[PDB]
């Protein structure tokens, strides 16, 4: 009984990161060693005419982005492990996350490595125009 959530392609990476002392570092190191990115993310069918902001209540991908369910792009959600922050609460779960289409083959690694501008809501380096 029960409902499967995962596919065999993710077994290795998820197992590795679930036991790791430093999950973030582990995933990065795993990628660096040739491991394939985590798959089975929640990719959205959307209009691609949105605002382009990084983390949003509804899908907001523009023409150069893909929208994903937020929990599915979060390493800590995917491995069912504790979150970095002091409250232990996730910033992606419960939202949609826009990922540049050039980087959409590894949405988990993208959110792990990048940061959102708190002024304009755009990814630093991938949309943020702030002076």
């Amino acid at each position: 009984a029960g409902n499967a959530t995962e596919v065999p392609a993710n077994s290795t990476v998820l197992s590795f990161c679930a036991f790791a002392v430093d999950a973030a570092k582990a995933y990065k190191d795993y990628l660096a060693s040739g491991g394939q990115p985590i798959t089975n993310c929640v990719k959205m069918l959307c209009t691609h005419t949105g605002t382009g902001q990084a983390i949003t209540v509804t899908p907001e991908a523009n023409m150069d982005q893909e929208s994903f369910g937020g929990a599915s792009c979060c390493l800590y959600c995917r491995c069912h492990i504790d979150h970095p922050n002091p409250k232990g609460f996730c910033d992606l779960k419960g939202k949609y996350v826009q990922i540049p289409t050039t980087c959409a083959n590894d949405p988990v690694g993208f959110t792990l490595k990048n940061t959102v501008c708190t002024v304009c809501g755009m990814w630093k380096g991938y949309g943020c125009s702030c002076d």
């Binding site: 009984a1 029960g2 409902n3 499967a4 959530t5 995962e6 596919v7 065999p8 993710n10 077994s11 290795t12 990476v13 998820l14 197992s15 590795f16 679930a18 036991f19 790791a20 002392v21 430093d22 570092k25 582990a26 190191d29 795993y30 660096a32 060693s33 491991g35 089975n40 993310c41 929640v42 990719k43 959205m44 069918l45 959307c46 509804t58 899908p59 369910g69 937020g70 929990a71 599915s72 800590y76 959600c77 995917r78 069912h80 492990i81 504790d82 979150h83 232990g88 609460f89 996730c90 779960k93 419960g94 939202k95 949609y96």
Partner: protein, 286 residues
């Protein structure tokens, strides 16, 4: 193809809102359209759920530079026979709010020690994963009678893992620089290790030159077997599954071919003892 790893054990089978589902597979069918998902304003998020996530199904076949592999060859195990600790876990079954996974109940080792844990699992919520007590029952059946009293005698996991580290340190400090868990049909022992093992690159002890065998979440430090007082996690253990060496049939029937002094007492530590015993006979006789 799907796996059992991270299976959602919620009693009533349903998916989640796209913003909350960890994976495409786990999205509610209402939102799915040929490989993709849609957002449906009007069908909101679930802000109260608690979904038990199964830890059954790990595969430690990673190959990452600088990270030692947990599972080792027979030849490497034989070099490290002084580190061998047989290990077996009897589980209880998730029930009521969830069905479909097993929680560690009695953890047994070749030292003769049995540790009892309160039934505890990994529960997804709208904001995080909550490591928490979950409803559980002993396995049905008369061969499992001895597990009924254990169901209310367990210790919390924070105590259990400290006791495991202390047992292993006391046992191994003058034997080896590591631990090799000797297993038979390793799936549920590996599941149980999620509760008390961390891995990473090799580290040294914070008090001496020995390799680190333990980790302390409270202080974010590492220690060897000699200096692990108060430490809560086993760090970079090794392990081997004796069953994978070509045996046919169950543990006891194979153990009994070579040994006449370990009567099967049907308890975790007894399986752990027979597993190490069988491994010794197979590797060092003939």
């Amino acid at each position: 193809n799907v796996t059992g790893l991270f299976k959602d054990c919620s009693k009533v089978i349903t998916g989640l809102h796209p913003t909350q589902a960890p994976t495409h597979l786990s999205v509610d069918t209402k939102f799915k359209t040929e490989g993709l998902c849609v957002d449906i304003p009007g069908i909101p998020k679930d802000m109260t759920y608690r979904r038990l996530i199964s830890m059954m199904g790990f595969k430690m076949n990673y190959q990452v530079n600088g990270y030692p592999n947990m599972f080792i060859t027979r030849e490497e195990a034989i070099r490290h026979v002084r580190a061998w600790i047989g290990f077996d876990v009897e589980g209880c079954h998730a029930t009521r709010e969830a069905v479909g996974t097993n929680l560690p109940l009695q953890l047994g080792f070749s030292t003769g020690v049995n540790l009892v844990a309160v039934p505890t699992g990994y529960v997804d919520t709208p904001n995080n994963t909550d490591f928490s007590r979950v409803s559980a029952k002993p396995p049905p059946g008369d061969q499992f009678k001895h597990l009924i009293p254990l169901m209310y005698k367990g210790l919390p996991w924070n105590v259990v893992r400290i006791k495991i580290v202390q047992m292993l340190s006391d046992t191994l400090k003058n034997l080896s620089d590591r631990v090799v868990f000797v297993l038979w049909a390793h799936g549920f022992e590996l599941t149980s290790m999620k509760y008390f093992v961390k891995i990473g690159p090799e580290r040294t002890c914070c008090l001496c030159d020995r390799r680190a065998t333990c980790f302390s979440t409270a202080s974010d430090t590492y220690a060897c077997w000699h200096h692990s007082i108060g430490f809560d996690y086993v760090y970079n253990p090794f392990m081997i599954d004796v069953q994978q060496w070509g045996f046919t049939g169950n543990l006891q029937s194979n153990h009994d071919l070579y040994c006449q002094v370990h009567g099967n007492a049907h308890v975790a530590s007894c399986d752990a003892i027979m597993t190490r015993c069988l491994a010794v006979h197979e590797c060092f006789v003939k």
